[PDB]
Amino acid sequence: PKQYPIINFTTAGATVQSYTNFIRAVRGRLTTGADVRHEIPVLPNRVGLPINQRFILVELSNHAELSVTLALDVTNAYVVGYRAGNSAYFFHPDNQEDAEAITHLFTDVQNRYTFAFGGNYDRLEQLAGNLRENIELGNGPLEEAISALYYYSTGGTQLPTLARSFIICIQMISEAARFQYIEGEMRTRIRYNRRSAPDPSVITLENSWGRLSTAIQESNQGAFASPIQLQRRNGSKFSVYDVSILIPIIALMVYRCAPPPSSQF
Amino acid sequence: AQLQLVETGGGLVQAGSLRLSCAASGSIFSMHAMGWFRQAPGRERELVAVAPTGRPSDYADFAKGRFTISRDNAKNTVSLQMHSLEPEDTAVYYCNAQLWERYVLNDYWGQGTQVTV
Ligand code: NI
Ligand code: NI
Incomplete structure (x- = not known):
């Protein structure tokens, strides 16, 4: 499930307006906006948040007509894993509660895996072999990242490439939100x-x-x-x-x- | 499990050396940076030197040349070697540890060590 809310975005023919529409839609599903402090909305408190409200999904497509679906945690807006066809992969959790929560994502997928690395930038940068300072962002990088995530399960994407792809998605989606x-x-x-x-x-x-x-x-x-x-x-x-x-x-x-x-x- | 920061190496000194050190313990999944800040009475807390993971050390203007920070990424220790100390450097010195936790960068601070010149 995948009965969590889904927002779609495609890099194919993407425009300033389509990207804006997407980010606004993502923000709208991340939080109700009912908790605002000094004019700035707050994400839901993790403490007491029911698992059926914990995640949203972002389905990304590109020119190659490949699709992948990222899962974002509403308590921090961050990408926690993704699904491509019959396989799903998740960043390594740091605590039992989070490890348990991600079992509720993509529950009908045939093959599920936990990566041997966490998803914070220090770890992804180490795996990528470059810092955020040297990783290009834009529609082109996003197009490539989607293909790279898509080909990972079949052995076609090496880990440094995969890590760079996550750094691109995280900043263009999570940080933009x-x-x-x-x-x-x-x-x-x-x-x-x-x-x-x-x-x-x-x-x-x-x-x-x-x-x-x-x-x-x-x-x-x-x-x-x-x-x-x-x-x-x-x-x-x-x-x-x-x-x-x-x-x-x-x-x-x-x-x-x-x-x-x-x-x- | 709770992060603890233990600072050592403070004290009294006079113009023209002193070394501070901090060791972190507890559950540390990813330490983004360890560094040293300082605060004098009636003034704001200020950066002295910070060693972020994968990047050059960052020194405040007043520390250039004089001070050297040294971070051991594996051991989660950071030290600060200070030379050519002035009375203007008198302050409470604090170790800072910046940890990624649940995809957010959280600051933690030592209890502070007095340095008097
Ligand atoms: Ni206000
Ligand atoms: Ni459960």
Whole structure:
């Protein structure tokens, strides 16, 4: 199941508008938007979330007319595994609860596997043999990633290629869902039919999703207890002291704490 | 299972060396970075040097040349060798460990060690 909600996207003839429609649809299934803090929606709390509400599926197709279906965890927007035909593969979980939860995905698939690696960027970068800094994003990279995921089960994709493919999907789908800024970066690449690696503004934002989510949620009025350092496109560092500059940048936060009074507005 | 950070090597010193060290224990699935920050009374907490996985060490301007960070990825230890210390470097020094957990990067902090110059 695969009775979880499914959102479809194809790279074939993809446009700025079709990509925007897709990311907006993904956000809509990740969270109801009923929990908002300082104008920014929060994903559902993992604690107490029923398994029938835990995942959504993204069915990706490309020009080669190959399809794969990614599973995303609504509590963190991240890719946890995928199905291609009669085989499904999952990142290695870190805890029993997550290991148990993924058994509820793709339950009719003939062949199920857990990868001998986790899906966090450190691990995927190590396997890929490159950092996010050197892995190009765009419609072209996504097209290739879909083919690579598709050919993995039959022995046709080596692990470093597979890891690179996951890094591409994760940033173009999960990180784009989490951040309007990164959705915008991907829109620009599609607009100009361009492939290019993410600059430091994107990578530091990705890394900081957790600490930004904590800083915003722990604030009564949106001012941070401690500033958080981000980077500009040219790599220079700056400090963020409150939520205001982040409202146009972050689309969704991971649940970190119950809302202090007034933090809902 | 809970991450613990144990800091060593603080103390009193005078202008012109001192070495800090931190060892992490507990369930560590993926350590993205280990580093050292510092905070003086009446000032914000600030980065001194950080060693992110797979990348060059990142030093604050004031640490360039003077300080050297050293991370042992296998052992989850990080040390900071400081030379040419000034009174302006007086602060509480904190070890920072950044761990990927459930696909989110979480910060953890040592209890802090006083350095007085
Ligand atoms: Ni507010
Ligand atoms: Ni179950």
